[PDB]
Design a protein around this ligand. Sequence first.
Ligand SMILES: CCOC(=O)C(=O)N1CCCCC1
Length: 165
Amino acid sequence: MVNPTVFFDIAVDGEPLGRVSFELFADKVPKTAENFRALSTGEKGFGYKGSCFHRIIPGFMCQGGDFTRHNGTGGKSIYGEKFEDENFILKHTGPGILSMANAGPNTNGSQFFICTAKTEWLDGKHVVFGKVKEGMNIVEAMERFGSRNGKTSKKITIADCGQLE
Ligand SMILES: CCOC(=O)C(=O)N1CCCCC1
């Protein structure tokens, strides 16, 4: 151990954009970090590779991780279907925060978002579990394919993903 590092290679209608890497806070939210880690390697036989960022809102966040329905209504965890909010120790303090999307309390599956700003109104509502390490420039590039309601102007996909260490 040590907190693990995962990467995504991002593409735009298939054209490579670049690599984003994340530190996952297994020291504070081990169950949540492990879900995202395993979905990033695909070790359970499903996961993030090939999925899209379906909702990108400039100045707010980039949301993805629905690998089952590919529209924001789907996705599942490595623990069945959904799991509890683990804790809310960490806060949405600024750009680069990685946090769990949900449909209300205790409905974590696979969907997640990457903040591009401080979003303190999500504190206590979404479980923060990591941060961007490398590639914030790529997140900023992704953000530019979003819109105010979150519809993307091109398809923003996870071409590849996995664990770095
Ligand atoms: C910024 C994260 O957004 C979400 O998790 C999301 O999709 N929703 C927020 C919670 C209610 C349903 C809609």
